[PDB]
Structure 1
Amino acid sequence: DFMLIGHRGATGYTDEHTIKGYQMALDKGADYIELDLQLTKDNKLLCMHDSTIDRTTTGTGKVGDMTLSYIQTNFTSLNGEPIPSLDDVLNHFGTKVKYYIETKRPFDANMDRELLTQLKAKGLIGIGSERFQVIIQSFARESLINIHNQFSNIPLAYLTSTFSESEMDDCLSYGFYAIAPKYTTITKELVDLAHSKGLKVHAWTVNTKEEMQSLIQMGVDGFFTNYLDEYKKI
């Protein structure tokens, strides 16, 4: 009844968005590994939070300006792990793990298409797939609506830095499964209102046991954390 999400893998303990980090998240008790995706010049999907590789890799530049091959052959994560593609992660873990996958902005129909192509190739969506094995999240309503039009049974989470009744109503209108608000905007009254509308609430990004306890008392259905070991201390 509660979803513990490893934010970019196990970010508090190791490099974000590495297969080593995704594995560490699973080892530390995450229900879901969380991927952020950026579109390469050749319309492949890179596990990368920022539009640019400058902060987290040995390289620089916009992901959209380089081919997947150029990025993976020339650069590594800060501490030397490979920079994984969506394909690399799905090939590594297959149907053994649950994925919480963000389409980063700007909205791009090519990103949505490539995401659905890679998931379908592993049987993670469409016929015979387990509901909740993949949740897709975005700040871009356009990405979630486009995906919902193509694969109506994938649970979708709308990412927001606010938590208003108008946003909950939009989630209902477009058939989204969850609203995913910044955790400091959440109150028990707002969670109860979301629940009354048939929405789940997935809070991000909570990093202390005290703040985890507060969110659980408010009745959130899940949260994203950098520090999975803190959940075992609640």
Structure 2
Amino acid sequence: PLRLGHRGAPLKAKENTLESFRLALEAGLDGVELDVWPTRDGVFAVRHDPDTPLGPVFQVDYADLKAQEPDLPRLEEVLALKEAFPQAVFNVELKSFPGLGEEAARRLAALLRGREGVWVSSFDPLALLALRKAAPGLPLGFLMAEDHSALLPCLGVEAVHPHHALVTEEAVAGWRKRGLFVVAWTVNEEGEARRLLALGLDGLIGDRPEVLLPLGG
């Protein structure tokens, strides 16, 4: 299964920073998950929190956020790591300012046109619908904090990204019936990691590379 670094390797370097992503890949992980929010000027800032010292991300220009936060990456810079790690995959989680999700989705779709080794996930069903319409060939995943599997038949997604607590033998059987790729999060314990892999999951997103590395055989 895919061993993915949550925001890179968050315990080795600050989460969602270029250094973190690089360290996660140097550790031997198959890829990384990264959080993005659109800035006022349409740049996808790589960070988890939508609130900044200058206000919400969508109300601030990237250059201003960068002056305030010098280590704040923009999406293209993280994806550029594929040059050093050609086999690495990137899971971009598009974070919606619900109601602003569709517009952000259309902007992200255009940016990722024809890009390989990347798939986008989101907790926002509306953003996923917009993404699929704007970029039919872009792989997508539906993030779920609670079991909202009922929406899967209406979403154009190749994967489901359930919180690990939602992963049970019966839930997995349901996702398999639909031929979905299952990636759990956020797995930082060996015990839980082995419970999930025993169920046949296709990927795990976690904060500790050491826990994920030995998984898969």
Q: TM-score, length-normalised on structure 1? A: 0.83
* Residue equivalent to 1:118: 111
CA shift in 2, pair 1:92/1:216, >3 Å: closer
Structure 1 residue 88 displacement after superposition: 2.4
Match of 1:207 among 157, 164, 188: 188
- Amino acid of the residue matched to residue 135 of structure 1? W
Q: Secondary structure at the match of 2:19?
A: helix
CA distance in 1, matches of 2:5, 2:43: 23
- Amino acid of the residue matched to residue 62 of structure 1? P
Structure 1 residue 51 displacement after superposition: 0.9
Structure 1 residue 233 displacement after superposition: 5.0
CA contact (8 A) 1:6 1:225 kept: yes
CA contact (8 A) 1:161 1:181 kept: yes
CA contact (8 A) 1:206 1:226 kept: yes
Residue 161 in 1 paired to residue 145 in 2?
yes
Residue 4 in 1 paired to residue 42 in 2?
no
Identical amino acids, percent of aligned pairs: 27
CA contact (8 A) 1:43 1:110 kept: no
CA distance in 1, matches of 2:162, 2:81: 30
- Amino acid of the residue matched to residue 89 of structure 2? K
CA contact (8 A) 1:46 1:86 kept: yes
Deviates more, 1:32-41 or 1:59-68: 59-68
Unaligned runs of 5+ in 1: 54-58, 77-81, 125-129
- Which structure dedicates a bigger proportion of its chain to strand? 2
- Amino acid of the residue matched to residue 131 of structure 2? I
Unaligned runs of 5+ in 2: none
CA shift in 2, pair 1:18/1:195, >3 Å: same
CA distance in 2, matches of 1:47, 1:7: 12
CA contact (8 A) 2:3 2:213 kept: no
Instruction: Give the aligned length.
Output: 211
Structure 1 residue 113 displacement after superposition: 2.7
Q: Secondary structure at the match of 2:3?
A: strand
Match runs of 1:27-176 below 5 Å:
27-53=26-52, 59=53, 61-76=55-70, 82-94=71-83, 96=86, 97-107=88-98, 108=100, 109-120=102-113, 123-124=114-115, 130=116, 133-163=117-147, 167-176=148-157
Q: Secondary structure at the match of 1:184?
A: helix
* Residue equivalent to 1:221: 202
Superposed CA deviations along residues 183-206 of structure 1, whole A, max 9, x for unmatched, are: 012111211221122112111101
Structure 1 residue 60 displacement after superposition: 5.1
- Amino acid of the residue matched to residue 98 of structure 1? V
Structure 1 residue 151 displacement after superposition: 1.4
Q: Secondary structure at the match of 1:13?
A: coil
Structure 1 vs Structure 2 CA RMSD: 1.9
* Residue equivalent to 1:180: 161
Superposed CA deviations along residues 95-148 of structure 1, whole A, max 9, x for unmatched, are: 83321011112242332233223223xx41xxxxx4xx1111001101111011
Q: Secondary structure at the match of 2:112?
A: helix
* Residue equivalent to 1:193: 174
